[PDB]
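Fill in residues.
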């Protein structure tokens, strides 16, 4: 009757407890994934039955407020969330996706669809801040959870809601997609720090779709043409093959193979 749920709280969160959480998220996402090749491929959108389409992530904090994010298993991205008796959805791209989300949170009294989508370019505009200037960490995540809840009571304004999406998406969706970004978050939790992400994280996020295409279209592991990434100091380098990214990227959106 309900999609699978993973739980996480920032209250007393540790390196261990955040590691368990991301591992469970990856586990639910890859139930239907293709794991025969070097890197797991998320289920194909086309033909996926509706009862396999979503998973739910339920978050709480020291103030013991709770919100629940809905994640698409085909791309591990947040499509919307529930707070109290209300559900809120990013604007869908097409009719099929609009129909799919009517199967989420079917028991809330109030359903709203934002005019905007959930991509970073738009969310950065609404927040008034680039990812480069939005701190990540347990502290920021705790604050993001309260902000998401209080949107349903009129206590949160849309720019702060946008910045809270940016924090949640990166610390959950992107940390599940990339072992590399999980480690970046793990270091922040370990030393009790909050800091904005460096250029390597942002460029990895911006490249996930392109890397999924290059990997699944590769021939004997070799890319048909290079993809350019950044080190943490902003310097640039090229990747040419699948293998060097096996420790870096954990999940891929389905791509056709010629
Ligand atoms: O700051 C650094 O030293 C590095 C950052 C990255 C490196 S190295 C990398 C090396 C191979 C393959 C993918 C990556 C992703 C980001
Ligand atoms: Cl480890
Ligand atoms: Cl809806
Ligand atoms: Cl808009």
């Amino acid at each position: 009757k309900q999609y699978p749920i993973i739980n996480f709280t920032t209250a007393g969160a540790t390196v261990q407890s955040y590691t368990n959480f991301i591992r469970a998220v990856r586990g639910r996402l890859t139930t239907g994934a293709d794991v025969r090749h070097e890197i797991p491929v998320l289920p194909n959108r086309v033909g996926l039955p509706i009862n396999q389409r979503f998973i739910l992530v339920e978050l709480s904090n020291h103030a013991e407020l709770s919100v629940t994010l809905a994640l698409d298993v085909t791309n591990a991205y947040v499509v919307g969330y529930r707070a109290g008796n209300s559900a809120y959805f990013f604007h869908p791209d097409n009719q099929e996706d609009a129909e799919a989300i009517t199967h989420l949170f079917t028991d809330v009294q109030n359903r709203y669809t934002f005019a905007f989508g959930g991509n970073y370019d738009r969310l950065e505009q609404l927040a008034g801040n680039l990812r480069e200037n939005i701190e990540l960490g347990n502290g920021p995540l705790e604050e993001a959870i309260s902000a998401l809840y209080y949107y349903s009571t009129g206590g949160t304004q849309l720019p702060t809601l946008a910045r809270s999406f940016i924090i949640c998406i990166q610390m959950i969706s992107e940390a599940a997609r990339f072992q590399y970004i999980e480690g970046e978050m793990r270091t922040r939790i370990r030393y009790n720090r909050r800091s904005a992400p460096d250029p390597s994280v942002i460029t990895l996020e911006n490249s996930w779709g392109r890397l999924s295409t290059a990997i699944q279209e590769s021939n004997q592991g070799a890319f048909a043409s290079p993809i350019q990434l950044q080190r943490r100091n902003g310097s640039k380098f090229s990747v040419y093959d699948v293998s060097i990214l096996i420790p870096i990227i954990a999940l891929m959106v389905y791509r056709c193979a010629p």
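The chain has two domains: 1-176, 177-258.
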